[PDB]
């Protein structure tokens, strides 16, 4: 019952490649990612207003 005592927290958000390229140093392994399999239609857990 205390948010401070929590060990972890997980959030899922929508992002595009330009956002990741804004800070090229911070992110790695961008070329291996595939964009078709990870999509809002393919992931049912994510809830969003995007068509």
């Amino acid at each position: 019952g205390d948010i401070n005592k929590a060990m972890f927290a997980i959030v899922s958000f929508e992002t595009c490649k330009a956002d990741l390229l804004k800070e090229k140093d911070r992110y790695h392994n961008l070329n291996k990612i595939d964009w078709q399999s990870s999509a809002p239609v393919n992931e049912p857990d994510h809830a969003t207003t995007t068509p």
Binding site: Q36, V41, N42, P44
Partner: peptide, 27 residues
């Protein structure tokens, strides 16, 4: 009455491979 989960099991859209190849010439 029953407790529907309200998730709507749906099937996604099948891929297309020939169409991106083709260039389009306007009429």
């Amino acid at each position: 009455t029953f407790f529907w989960l309200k998730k709507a099991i749906i099937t996604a859209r099948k891929e297309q491979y020939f169409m991106p190849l083709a260039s389009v010439t306007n009429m």
